[PDB]
Each structure stands twice: as structure tokens, then as C-alpha cells.
Write a protein that binds this ligand. Structure first.
Ligand SMILES: NC(=O)C1=CN([C@@H]2O[C@H](COP(=O)(O)OP(=O)(O)OC[C@H]3O[C@@H](n4cnc5c(N)ncnc54)[C@H](O)[C@@H]3O)[C@@H](O)[C@H]2O)C=CC1
Ligand SMILES: N=C(N)NCCCCN
Length: 403
């Protein structure tokens, strides 16, 4: 039997619990530490099975029905004996699960971030301590599905499910169940999971700048004047924002190259241009792909997608807060900035974006190019956990003298 603990009670948690529990020889324990979400889910589901509606490419809908073994807020029941522990929650909830699982997680456990967001492994290492080197840490780029709960506890819809998805892996000393094939089995035929060469590649390939860039490209020098209605998001970018995304992406390559040169045996060559990335994973949706601007603006899976806005005098105004900034900055850009400092690589365009973004949401992470902001302890930059060197970042071991 493979024993999976699904952490969370969101769209993803519902879907993953639904899908994973439908597989033969799989036992699912749902863990959720959000107050009494666990009891609520339980009362709601009753004696029925959890239902997942999957929208196929045919336009048809397949119904998956299954039941988890237990739905609980008790980590001892959820984590003990678990072969795989999958965290599917907004990144701010990760700290709580790592803290809860710590004294119950076995050496052999595969600890999965679905999705991880940036700094997932640094946090995991810090919280689990000496147990971190034993377990394996798996980081997935994004969520496998586009999904929404329809009826809490008992029904979730997959609007679409990704064709391919990448994940990185830090192997522990303990032999886990096979990370890639086990995860694949839980998800079914799709996405077709591939293994990223190195976890830092996966972290950098998050392109945490993307959403901060887009918001800046449309609201950067915003004269305060309202607009009639929510402007297009991705499809609404101009040439300047495209260039900005190219600049940031290059800064990603810069950091990647610096690590490789300072640290032999760390293959980060799969860090590619955002433009080169778009064509790899959206080609069938892009009608005009001669450059990055056109690659993004003619992307058919970006149509109808608009900025978050709110009602103001004489029209509509950008709605910051959201998760483009409250997540992508502390759980994204800052982490990348932490690696950039450790590599010694300047990244003026990422910096430009951080400084602007944090002000919008009334947070402070970066000050004078240095990670000394008011709320820097709420981020996952490796420096926050005392991982200050590339070696510390890579291996999780601090230094270490010795009189
Ligand atoms: N289609 C989708 O739902 C997409 C979501 N994602 C990403 O995947 C991640 C998971 O997505 P969802 O499952 O939709 O997230 P969600 O927003 O549905 O998750 C809500 C869950 O977060 C936890 N939570 C909320 N407030 C909390 C609190 N203050 N303290 C402790 N726990 C709390 C609870 O368990 C709650 O059930 C997100 O980071 C999202 O950005 C990525 C692609 C698509
Ligand atoms: N890391 C990637 N390759 N893609 C990120 C998916 C977008 C999540 N906002």
C-alpha cells in the first residue's frame, strides 16, 4: 500500500484527495490544520464519496468518486506511516504543516510541494532539522489542474488539467517510494510529469517576476486616473512589459550561471529564456510566436483574463493585495533575491519590481538592495533561515569552525 497524506482543504486538496484515493493500493489521509476545517469536511462529506468532475478535451466530463481513509486535524493520525506527504495549500500555510509533521514524519517520507512556490525546501530543512537530510523534498512548478470546489467537502471540478508538469527532487539518505512514478500514479495519465535536473533550476524557473512585471507594466506609472473596465492581463501587456520579462528572465540565467561556476556538479542548464519557455509549453495555443510579445498576447489560453480591479470614483482601479503580490513577492521574488545575493549577482530589474510591488501591498522585504525589510522574516529567502552561502543553500548544512 502507498499511504498519502494530503495537506490542505482548498481546491487542490479536494482534487488531489479525490484523485489519489481513487487509485488501487492507495490510502489517503487528509490533513488540514485550518481551525476545524477537518471536522467541517467530515460533516459535509458524511457517508458519501468525494466527487471530482474532470473536463476532458472532448468537452465531456468524467466523474471520479472516492473516499479518503480519514479526514483529520491530527498530524499523528495523518503523517504517521505516510509514504508521501503532499502540501497543496497557499504557501503561507506551509510553515504550519512542516511544524505539525516534524515529530511524526518517517525517514523514508517523500515530502511534496504541489505547488511549492519558492523557498519550499529551505523552510522544510529549517523546520525538520536533522530529519531533513533523511527525507526527500519534491517541488512541483504549479498546480496540475485548474480546479474549483463546487460543494465543500464533497464536490470539486477540474476545468482543465495540464499536459506536462515538471518537478525537482532533493534526494535524502532514506529510500522513498519512487517520487516521479508514484506521483504520476496518483494523478493518472495527466500531466505527464518530468524530473527537473536541479531544485534551484525549478525555483528560478518559477519566473516569480512575471505577475509583478505585468501589474507594473500596466499600473507602474499609473497617474491615479480610473479606467472604464478591467483591462486584459497577459493579452494586455505592451512591448515595454515584454522587454521587462526578457530582462528578468536574463537575470535568472545570470544567477543560474553564477551558481554553476561557483559550484561544480550542480547542473542548472535547463534555466531557459521565458520566451524559449513559452513555446515549449504553450505552442499549441499560441497563434503568432515570432517573439515574446506576440507569444504572450496571442496565447488562446490567456483570452478573457483580466486585471483584478475594484470600483472607484469615475470607473475602475487596480486591486492589489491579491496573490500576484502577497504570494509571488514573499514566497517568490524575495527567495530568488536571496539566491541572487548568495551568488553575488546583481538583478536591477527584479529589484525594481520588488521595491514597487511591496509598497503596493504595504509590506517591506528589500531595503537598499539588502534583505533587511520590516517583514523579511515572513519570507522564505534562505538568509531568513541562516542559509547564507551557496553551499548552505545547496546542501542545507551551515558552517562550522572550530578553534
Ligand atoms: N486552479 C487553481 O485552484 C490554481 C491554484 N494554484 C495555486 O496552488 C495553490 C493551491 O491552490 P488552491 O487549492 O486553490 O488554494 P485555496 O485557496 O483553495 O486553499 C485554501 C486553503 O488554504 C488553507 N488556509 C487558508 N487560510 C489559512 C490560514 N490562515 N491558516 C492556515 N491555513 C489556511 C485552508 O486549508 C484552505 O482550505 C495556491 O497557491 C494557488 O496559487 C495554481 C494553479 C491553479
Ligand atoms: N514555474 C513554471 N514553469 N510555471 C509557473 C506557473 C504559473 C503559476 N502562477
Amino acid at each position: 500500500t502507498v499511504k498519502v497524506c494530503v495537506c490542505g482543504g482548498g481546491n487542490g486538496a479536494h482534487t488531489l484527495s479525490g484523485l489519489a484515493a481513487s487509485r488501487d493500493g492507495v490510502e489517503v489521509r487528509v490533513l488540514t490544520l485550518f481551525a476545524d476545517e477537518a471536522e467541517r469536511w467530515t460533516k459535509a462529506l458524511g457517508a458519501d464519496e468525494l466527487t471530482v468532475i474532470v473536463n476532458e478535451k472532448d468537452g465531456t466530463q468524467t466523474e471520479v468518486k472516492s473516499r479518503p481513509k480519514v479526514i483529520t486535524k491530527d498530524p499523528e493520525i495523518a503523517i504517521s506511516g505516510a509514504d508521501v506527504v503532499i502540501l497543496t495549500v497557499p504557501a503561507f500555510a506551509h510553515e504550519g504543516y512542516f511544524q505539525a509533521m516534524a515529530p511524526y514524519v518517517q525517514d523514508s517520507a517523500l515530502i511534496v510541494g504541489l505547488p511549492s512556490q519558492a523557498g519550499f525546501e529551505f523552510q522544510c530543512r529549517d523546520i525538520l532539522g536533522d530529519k531533513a537530510a533523511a527525507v526527500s523534498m519534491m517541488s512541483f512548478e504549479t498546480l496540475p489542474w485548474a480546479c474549483r470546489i463546487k460543494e465543500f467537502g464533497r464536490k470539486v471540478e477540474v476545468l482543465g488539467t495540464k499536459s506536462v508538469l515538471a518537478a525537482s527532487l532533493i534526494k535524502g539518505t532514506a529510500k522513498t517510494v519512487d517520487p516521479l512514478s508514484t506521483l504520476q500514479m496518483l494523478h493518472g495519465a495527466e500531466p505527464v510529469f518530468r524530473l527537473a535536473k536541479h531544485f534551484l533550476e525549478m525555483l528560478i524557473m518559477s519566473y516569480s517576476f512575471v505577475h509583478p512585471a505585468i501589474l507594473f507594466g500596466r499600473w507602474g506609472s499609473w497617474d491615479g486616473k480610473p479606467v472604464p473596465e478591467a483591462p486584459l492581463f497577459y493579452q494586455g501587456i505592451d512591448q515595454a512589459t515584454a522587454d521587462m520579462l526578457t530582462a528578468c528572465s536574463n537575470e535568472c540565467k545570470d544567477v543560474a550561471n553564477a551558481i554553476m561556476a561557483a559550484c561544480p556538479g550542480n547542473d542548472l542548464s535547463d534555466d531557459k529564456d521565458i520566451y524559449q519557455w513559452y513555446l515549449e509549453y504553450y505552442h499549441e495555443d499560441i497563434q503568432d510566436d515570432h517573439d515574446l510579445y506576440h507569444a504572450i498576447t496571442t496565447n488562446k489560453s490567456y483570452k478573457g483574463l483580466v486585471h483584478p480591479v475594484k470600483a472607484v470614483d469615475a470607473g475602475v482601479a487596480p486591486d492589489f493585495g491579491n496573490r500576484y503580490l502577497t504570494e509571488d513577492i514573499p514566497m517568490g521574488m524575495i527567495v530568488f533575491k536571496g539566491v541572487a545575493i548568495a551568488a553575488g549577482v546583481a538583478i536591477p530589474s527584479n529589484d525594481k519590481l520588488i521595491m514597487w510591488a511591496q509598497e503596493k501591498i504595504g509590506k517591506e522585504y528589500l531595503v537598499d538592495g539588502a534583505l533587511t525589510g520590516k517583514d523579511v522574516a515572513t519570507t522564505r529567502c534562505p538568509q531568513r533561515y541562516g542559509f547564507n552561502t551557496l553551499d548552505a543553500i545547496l546542501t542545507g548544512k551551515k558552517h562550522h569552525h572550530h578553534h
